């Protein structure tokens, strides 16, 4: 590894020695837009560097084209560059035509790349001094064999060594993309080693770690005990700040919507009870009748809902939910209280943040959409501070609206049975419908796909197949296609969790694009999301069917 966890401080010190100036901006940060973990890490770094009065600039980017253009725009005065949330999986020198001898003098510049994706570029590690990253504890142990081959490959019977090195390189490659650690977790480890931890840093770390609960529950379970221990280590006067470990549930905005709406829109309960048809609603009313909560009472706001049943909710759940297999909904979460404003939870906060990212406020309109996404990112960043709550209530209401729209589309998809089951992977295309203009956002599409994946996984089928989802935007006449990995049921043991399911969709897409002249545009930071033409989709799909996955 280049920078081990223990060496972080040293690198940090170098930054000061290269950036502490009186009237010169010598540090520029590029962040992975449309990502909560990147936003949390950027906020923590911004507070850190505001503490020591180090001048800096924050610049969000969306695609690799923007990255290259902005790197070209930069001047030699900028000694230090940060690249947080991306850049691990590719070699930047080839992308950025970086001449080491142009930047030798050594260390003319410094580029600190900080990314989470476990498979990445090995040459970026073992080849270049100029590019440097923070390892999470992967190169030291996992990559012990590949480095020998790379070092050796950097008399007539010696071709066996070359063949073995090529085979080792191929074996290391051809691996699907995954995430195994958190940028916010790494930054908080650095802060703990330095000695600047406080409640704001802990809150941002909690947000960053809980933003992965949807997709990387294994990583979340690995990281939870450290957060628990650290929060243990660290009269209701109007200035108290309380961070407590209170029981919580896999429910959608439980403390801001009615309990009925929470049970109705919770994805896990939807999957477990088939709420898209009438039998699900009948079983939900059975649930409520057997628990004993009146329907008109349970359809009231959580603030005005009855105090006695608010107190007895835990016992009611513990005694009622065993029969119907929902006993996995109970978990332990973090609750934040500051003043007389009320109480909030990490799950609700991240849902509000995601919704505010989604909704806020040919090539020309694509640029306009990307600019609007950048503006939404800035608005979500501004909403972080505790001095603004009209920028969080709006996010909560937008989250409710977006979940309603997603549910309305998903029930229609399920009833029309548009999910076509092929021999290898399932396919679904949204040709027509209402409110299709919302799904131009990749995160909205991923939310819809996550709900569909949960619904499909909570079934009696014994086939684990990837799902391909596509949409339409009539103004551009293009299909936005996203590849999705299968997921195990949340109520499963760790024995059958040897490795997370890998994503080969990016590899398949890049291979097909490199062998055929399709009019695609692969520029998103997420390598499994591409834009394809309506006329070109079908042959492309056929190729994907006939190619080795």
């Amino acid at each position: 590894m280049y920078y081990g966890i223990s060496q972080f401080s040293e690198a940090y010190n170098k930054i000061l020695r290269n950036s502490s100036s009186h009237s010169s901006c010598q540090l520029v940060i590029f962040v992975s837009c449309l990502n909560i973990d990147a936003l949390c890490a950027t906020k923590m770094l911004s507070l850190l560097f505001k503490k020591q009065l180090v001048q800096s600039q924050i610049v969000p980017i969306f695609g690799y084209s923007e990255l290259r253009r902005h790197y070209s725009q930069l001047d030699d005065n900028i000694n230090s560059l940060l690249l947080v949330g991306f850049g691990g999986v590719i070699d930047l020198e080839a992308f950025l035509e970086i001449d080491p001898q142009e930047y030798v003098i050594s260390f003319r510049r410094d580029i600190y790349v900080l990314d989470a994706h476990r498979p990445w570029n090995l040459d970026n590690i073992f080849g270049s001094q100029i590019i440097q990253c923070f390892d999470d504890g992967t190169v030291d142990d996992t990559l012990g064999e590949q480095k020998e081959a790379y070092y050796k490959l950097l008399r007539k019977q010696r071709k066996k060594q070359i063949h073995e090195y090529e085979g080792v390189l191929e074996e290391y490659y051809s691996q699907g993309t995954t995430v195994v650690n958190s940028i916010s977790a790494q930054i908080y480890s650095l802060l703990s080693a330095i000695g600047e931890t406080n409640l704001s840093n802990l809150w941002l770390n909690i947000l960053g770690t809980t933003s992965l609960d949807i997709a990387y529950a294994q990583v979340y379970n690995r990281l939870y005990p450290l957060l628990q221990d650290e929060v243990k280590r660290l009269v209701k006067t109007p200035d108290t700040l309380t961070l407590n470990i209170q029981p919580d549930y896999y429910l959608f905005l439980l403390r801001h919507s009615s309990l009925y709406d929470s049970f109705y829109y919770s994805n896990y309960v939807n999957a477990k009870l088939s709420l898209w048809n009438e039998n699900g609603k009948k079983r939900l009313h059975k649930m409520f009748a057997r628990m004993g909560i009146p329907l008109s009472t349970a359809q009231e706001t959580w603030l005005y809902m009855d105090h006695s049943i608010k107190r007895e909710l835990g016992i009611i759940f513990d005694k009622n939910l065993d029969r119907y297999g929902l006993q996995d909904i109970i978990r332990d979460g973090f609750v934040r209280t500051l003043g007389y404003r009320g109480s909030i939870s990490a799950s609700e906060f991240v849902e509000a943040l995601t919704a505010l990212l989604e909704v806020g406020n040919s090539a020309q309109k694509l640029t306009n959409l990307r600019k609007r996404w950048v503006s939404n990112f800035w608005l979500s960043w501004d909403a972080l501070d505790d001095r603004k709550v009209e920028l969080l209530n709006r996010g909560i209401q937008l989250a409710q609206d977006l979940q309603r729209a997603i549910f309305n589309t998903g029930v229609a998809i399920l009833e029309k049975k548009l999910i076509k089951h092929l021999r290898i992977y399932r396919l679904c295309v949204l040709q027509d419908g209402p409110d299709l203009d919302l799904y131009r956002n990749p995160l909205t599409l991923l939310r819809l796909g996550n709900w569909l994946i949960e619904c499909c996984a909570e079934s009696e089928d014994k086939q684990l197949l990837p799902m391909v989802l596509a949409s339409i935007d009539e103004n551009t006449d293009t299909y936005l296609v996203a590849g999705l990995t299968p997921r195990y049921p949340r109520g499963l043991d760790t024995i059958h969790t040897k490795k997370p399911i890998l994503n080969n969709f990016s590899m398949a897409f890049q291979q097909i694009t490199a062998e055929t002249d399709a009019k695609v545009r692969i520029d998103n930071f997420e390598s499994s999301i591409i834009e394809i033409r309506r006329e070109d989709l079908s042959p492309f799909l056929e190729k994907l069917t006939l190619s080795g996955l």
Binding site: T516, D517, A518, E535, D536, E542, K543
Partner: protein, 112 residues
């Protein structure tokens, strides 16, 4: 040839005219199979680089239509030629709908 054959057969027998009513029945099935095969081959060989020469849409003076799929215009012209019968309209419309069902299009779409 089919039209000439059916007119000769009618004359042999003796706004509607029976000289031509019943001529599309002779070639419907081979046409359907040929169109299926052509669609499959176009789907398979449209994205290949070396086969892109034969799918190039020619340009001529006075042309104004920009369009993508050649087989669609082939079948559109083939059906429009038949539609000039003015006496077997329903049969031609049925055959046109059947041909369009091979594509994922509808009877009264603007693209058709």
């Amino acid at each position: 040839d089919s039209m000439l054959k059916t007119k000769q057969s009618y004359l042999k027998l003796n706004s509607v005219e029976n000289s031509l009513n019943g001529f599309s029945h002779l070639f419907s099935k081979p046409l359907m199979k040929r169109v299926k095969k052509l669609f499959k081959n176009q789907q398979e060989f449209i994205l290949d680089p070396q086969y892109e020469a034969d799918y190039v849409i020619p340009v001529l003076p006075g042309s104004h239509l920009n369009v993508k799929n050649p087989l669609l215009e082939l079948v559109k012209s083939l059906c429009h030629v038949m539609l000039l019968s003015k006496s077997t309209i329903l049969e031609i419309r049925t055959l046109r709908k059947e041909l369009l069902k091979i594509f994922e299009l509808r009877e009264f779409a603007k693209v058709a």
